[PDB]
Design a binder for these strands. Structure first.
Ligand code: MG
Ligand code: MG
Lengths: 305, 317, 306, 318
RNA sequence: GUCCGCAUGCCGUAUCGGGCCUUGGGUUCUAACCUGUUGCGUAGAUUUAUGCAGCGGAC
RNA sequence: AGUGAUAAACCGGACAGUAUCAUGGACCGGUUUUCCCGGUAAUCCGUAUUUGCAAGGUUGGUUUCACU
DNA sequence: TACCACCAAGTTCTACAGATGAGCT
DNA sequence: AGCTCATCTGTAGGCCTGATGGTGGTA
DNA sequence: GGCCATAAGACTTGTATTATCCCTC
DNA sequence: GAGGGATAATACAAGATACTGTTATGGCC
């Protein structure tokens, strides 16, 4: 079993093979379909058939090669780059370069033996991509709303025209998201379950489903709450900002306008917890209950809370 | 002569009068047209005819009251908010940081006797509004451009639709700016003079007019370069203390923002600019250091050319 | 007819800037020497300047000779805390820092702010303060060597031991010199005795307090003297003499631990859930105020008041 | 067969964590005393732990006795730079309960990394380092009193003048004790003479260099010794877009880095080989302090080089 | 009701540090070349939030 | 101490943003320093968006209940 | 009258200065 | 033997840890 | 069945801008 | 003569003040 580190750039890949005997092989390739084919050929040239490959999440530039190698039948791991940075310090490395990084990742692979990565399902990719786009538009819409607050009259026609366009485009995406989940029987069913939770509506169900996926890739609900960056350490914030930010207003609605939410808010209020601290707790609770309800396969039952 | 400080917020004004005899008169008002009329009456009530008011430049919320008082005939100074903060720290060693009161502003006014403020011409206000709008849409356009690189396929129709919209809008504002400056014969002439400078074109000339204005409100070109935050900040004391010089950046960000690309065009594609680049390069200056020097130079020549009243003459450089 | 004069100060040179009533400036550079200071007084009288208010930053001890020269010549002198000058420059919108700029800045500071006049301290106060801060220096070095004995190698031990003996003898010598100083003055002797009547304050703290409180009633309120030490909150400000603040912590511990009035104070704050060091912080402020209070009263400490 | 043991040390107590081949742990606390150390070894031999690799953090003199005990008991001991410990913990997860490093973490560090084995220094190497370190302390104190002379009040000056004399005599005394140490050992006498043959290295810098290099050559390459001093440039590069400036890493002993600054200033100013090096670098647009940095690295590297060569400084090689 | 008095309550995390650890990257390949800004020392200045409470005195 | 179970309890301060303000050090001719008067589109002192904008990654600590 | 231990525990600013080794007087 | 003089914006990381002064208590 | 008010108060890689010149149709 | 592409720069830190929106639900007509 070989261990292979790949350092990724926009244009090139730097590869470092760590042989069982402990010697290294190194080569650069273009970060292209042609380059990826050269890489697989080169590995099978040196009779490397069984290998565990470690690569860092580097924008989207690592994705095609990771899929390529997975299909070629290698174990691929895509690591959070924070882990790689800490690892480099733990090895007492005194430089940061492409070849240094590729070698660091081969050692990471051997010592840590990280979990294997799976390529997401085409629909999972699509839904995530629509949810991320929708959030980008929403942010732009908010920028333009803030501007109306202090805008001069000559500026105001421009801002208004833009707000109309952005409102129409947001509505179009929402329908494109709905069509996606309605067409897949699994997603249609899983979305209907998420919405049964009081405090979770159309917008938040699509976000939750985008990050949970089609399958139950988490063993326990609390792992998904950790995934979102919501568990205390202060909150870790070791997780997707986009998932975490999407739960804040659902938390307020829950703690304010639902039976199970108010019950939770009061119990923590009694123990002398401040406004946001409760919302923090409710965010973590919504994440956990959302995953729980999907495992159960059954509508939200308030009796459990 | 009285000394009045006004502490401004969205909804409420807080006023503090400082009498010649050294006593204070304080009152709060609404930040509305009604509130501003109450204020003038309340001053005129206490026979305060001559005064020097000092207001922080907090944003658009303090502009209506400043214009109200300027019209009522008082002397109004609108001060950079960072001066107020620094003034407080000069008044004691343990003063409440992050607090500048109306009382503190009345003192500021008395001690410093700041320069008077003049409400801008309606045409200057218009042009500045359009230019600032133009810059905002450019930034959104660059946001969406950056996204096309790494976008997923489902996302691309959306990003493409938005880019076409933003281009059409940018083209429209450009025309609106052009129609503004062409319908005023002074601005039409002044803009033509700016664009005669090699490295200054349609977009930079508008930004420059927006901040120079119709009148010549700077006595010297070196003051306009200071205004943009482009001058080097020297730091020396005695024999021991010798800080390195750097662009001060104490000045208007929108001006400074607009001059970097012109500077890069001037030092690259132009005689008088390459002349300047080569000299400083010989004397050991790095590439982006030279750019910062060209930024200050363009500012200063822009003001020089307008004051001269004739097109850019290369012989002077 | 009052002129306003700024002086920027360096080790070797002085930059002087004179702001006239009519509003025009006169400037000149001088050597920072006895001869230079004489040239300065001549240059002013040359320009027919008798009434001036002079403003100079506290710049180590380099500003002190010229401050004394000008005060003796009969001018008004203000020695300003330079943190105020830096804020002033920023309030004045200045974009460069040079010696000629700073001298001009200080002349305006003078005109606008009209700071309180500076009085040169009494020779006895100057000496006492000098001995106290020396004593503190050597105590710092003694603690360093003493900390080293813990982890020291055996070849290092003879050296560290020999130094500890030297520093102990020197500290004793200085303490005696301080005692001889305060004894030879009737007022200081009396005031020293009053301060030591406070439970928690002994030979060492009393000399530090005398060295900053003055010979006379210098402060108008107790909390002013507590602010002077950097003890009033704004978190504790720490904007004040570190040598005075340093001196009050161990008194504060012994008082809150082993005195009636101090334990009383400790318990009151402990009732309201205050941490160990937070109580000590509070006790430091209190001691500073009571030290000032007792001296003003002119009579020994009375616990009944607290 | 091989066990992996972490030891979390404090002044008073040890906290031990054995990690067995099967993957289960043993834990027991001991007193940090001669008794405790003897008790620890017996407890290990009780559980028939004869082959092990112990891993301890380098926290000072409080952990040295136990490390020596175990080394003599026949185990493999590693004394790790504690910064490695903290970084390893962060590499093990994204949301760890605490940032602290404990005995269990050290056992896992040891298993995954199999760090290099620690060796107790020679008694003379230990003595020489101790004397050199003491000398540096006395210099700093002397420098403090020199600075005070400048702005002292008159009533203070007797005190400062008397201290300055005491410290000057003590520094002179300690220099002789260092000279006697190196002269008495034929190996150290020789090595020290070699170092002083280098232009720009004299009596003070030679003793500091010996103190860290020691009696034997424990670096495979001279460049590793410059790294040890923290004198090597730190490259920061990634892809097309990420390019930092190379700056002295400073990841090594301050004492060496401190010691070499003036030798570098002397070498580049007065010696031939140093001026040669200054000139070429200065021909490129290298600033004055940048060249000093470079010369500090070179001096470190040639110091190690010359000792490895075993023959005086040959100028023909430069 | 106002003005004064205060060794008053509310508010408060001192000072100086000390010791030990550190086995680059690239190259024309290890005392060569490209890549390099050490260490962190000294002195001086610092006058209330009387802000709000108490308690006391005078008018 | 491992192993499972967990939509329960304890620990929990999300994100994104918006608008606005800024009158050098000095140099060159007079005076014979500066100031002041006159001049500054020149020379020396400059690392833009007070370092802008985009994308990607993130599988709790414990408490209970079992089982050994 | 002299000696002991134990209480508490993880800001600004304005100016200055040494070091070491090789060559020169 | 003693003196001179060579560089100027600022920016590694970690883990162990303690005295001080004054008082009441003790010898 | 449609509309409105209300609840809280750091890692790994990338990138454009404008104005002038130069080129093709 | 009009329209479009390529291009110049690279370690980062170093002023302030005033402010706003997100979603999902239980209320309303
Ligand atoms: Mg990488
Ligand atoms: Mg000064």
């Amino acid at each position: 079993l070989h261990y292979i580190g790949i350092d990724t750039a926009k244009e090139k890949l730097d590869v470092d093979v760590l042989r069982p005997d402990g010697r290294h092989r190194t080569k650069k390739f273009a970060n292209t379909t042609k380059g990826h084919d050269e890489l697989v050929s080169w590995l099978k040239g040196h009779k490397i058939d069984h290998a565990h490959i470690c690569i860092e999440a580097t924008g989207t530039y690592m994705e095609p090669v990771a899929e390529c190698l997975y299909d070629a039948g290698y174990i691929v791991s895509v690591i959070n780059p924070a882990l790689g940075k800490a690892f480099a310090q733990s090895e007492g490395l005194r430089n940061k370069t492409d070849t240094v990084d590729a070698r660091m990742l081969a050692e990471f692979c051997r010592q840590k033996r990280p979990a294997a990565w799976e390529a997401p399902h085409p629909l999972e990719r699509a839904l995530r991509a629509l949810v991320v786009r929708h959030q980008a538009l929403t942010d732009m819409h908010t920028q333009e709303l803030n501007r109306t607050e202090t805008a001069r009259e000559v500026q105001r026609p421009s801002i208004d025209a833009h707000l109309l366009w952005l409102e129409a485009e947001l509505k179009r995406l929402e329908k494109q998201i709905k069509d996606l989940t309605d067409d897949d029987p699994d997603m249609k069913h899983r979305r209907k379950l998420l919405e049964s939770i009081p405090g979770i509506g159309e917008k938040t169900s699509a976000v939750l489903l985008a990050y949970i996926g089609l399958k139950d890739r988490f063993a326990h609900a609390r792992q998904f709450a950790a995934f979102a960056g919501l568990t205390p350490r202060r909150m870790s914030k070791a997780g997707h900002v986009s998932l975490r930010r999407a739960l804040y207003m659902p938390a307020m609605v829950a703690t304010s306008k639902t039976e199970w939410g108010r019950a939770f808010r009061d119990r923590l209020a009694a123990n002398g917890k401040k406004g946001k601290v409760i919302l923090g707790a409710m965010m973590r609770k919504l994440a956990q209950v959302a995953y729980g309800v999907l495992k159960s396969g059954v509508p939200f039952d308030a009796s459990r809370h």
